[PDB]
Structure 1
Amino acid sequence: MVLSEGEWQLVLHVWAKVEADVAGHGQDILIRLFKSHPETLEKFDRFKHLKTEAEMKASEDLKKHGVTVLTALGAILKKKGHHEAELKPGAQSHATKHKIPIKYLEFISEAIIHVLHSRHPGNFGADAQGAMNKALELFRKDIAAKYKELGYQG
């Protein structure tokens, strides 16, 4: 698939807002993922022990990881589809070290859309959400194709 320039503009316009507070958005998103799909928490040996949202909010370690996740995703989005090289080392770690099924990448995609919709309603109307959704679908498809080349396709 290919996003048009106007689609990339809607994505990067809301992303610019997100970047005013990377740590707070990172936290909101991981917590939304873990609350909505608790099975995903099981993949993190680092956070497996957290029992409530309160504990999650208080974890500086979780917040640090949120920053890491959104910084990597932001570097990919800013490539506007030219992300081949950037994708490769994360596809390999997520496929053979962490073992993350594509299903779970769909789950964090939903969490991202939820949080942006809640925090940026004026910049995240139907057209901007449609563009972000296509950008995340592009990302998942390319990561799925890499998974296949690497032997996981899990």
Structure 2
Amino acid sequence: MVLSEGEWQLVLHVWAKVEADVAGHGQDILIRLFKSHPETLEKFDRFKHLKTEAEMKASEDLKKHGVTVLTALGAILKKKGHHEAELKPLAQSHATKHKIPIKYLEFISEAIIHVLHSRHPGNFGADAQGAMNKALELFRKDIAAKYKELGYQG
């Protein structure tokens, strides 16, 4: 699959708003993820003890993680599909150390879309949401191919 330049621009124009407060968007996204799919929290030996949204919002380590995740994703999006270099180390750590199935990447993709839709109705209409879905699908497809090369079922 390949996105058009117009699709990339819709993706990057909403990402520009995310970048006003990457930390806040990261918290909202991780919390949505853990609330919708509580099993995903079990992957974080650092965070699996957090019991409530309140505890999640007050966690500095969780905030730090959201910034790390969104900054990595932002870098990948900015490559506009030319993301092999960024994807290599990410695919290896997530296949081999963290053991994150593609299904869980689908879950966080859903959380991203939900938070953007809630926070950014001005820049996340149907067309922009479609473009973001296409970008995240491409990310997941490319990660999935790497998983396979690396020996992980995903």
> TM-score interval w.r.t. the shorter chain?
over 0.9
Give the count of matched residue pairs.
154
What residue ranges of structure 2 are gaps of 5+ in the alignment? none
Give runs of ≥4 in structure 1 deviating > 4 Å: none
Q: 1:57-96: CA deviations, max 9, x gaps?
A: 0001100000000000000000000001110001000000
Question: Which residue is 2:112 aligned to?
Answer: 112
Task: Return the offset for 1:24.
Answer: 0.2
Q: 1:77-118: CA deviations, max 9, x gaps?
A: 000000011100010000000000000000000000000000
Task: Return the offset for 1:2.
Answer: 0.3
Identity of aligned residues (%): 99
Q: 1:26-50: CA deviations, max 9, x gaps?
A: 0000000000000000000000000
Question: Which residue is 2:135 aligned to?
Answer: 135
Task: Return the offset for 1:153.
Answer: 2.2
Q: Distance in 2 between matches of 1:68 and 1:86?
A: 13
Q: Distance in 2 between matches of 1:22 and 1:31?
A: 14
Question: Which residue is 2:37 aligned to?
Answer: 37
What residue ranges of structure 1 are gaps of 5+ in the alignment? none
1:55 matches 2:45: no
Give TM-score scaled by structure 1 length.
0.99
Q: Distance in 1 between matches of 2:49 and 2:107?
A: 20
Give TM-score scaled by structure 2 length.
0.99
RMSD over aligned Cα, in angstroms? 0.4
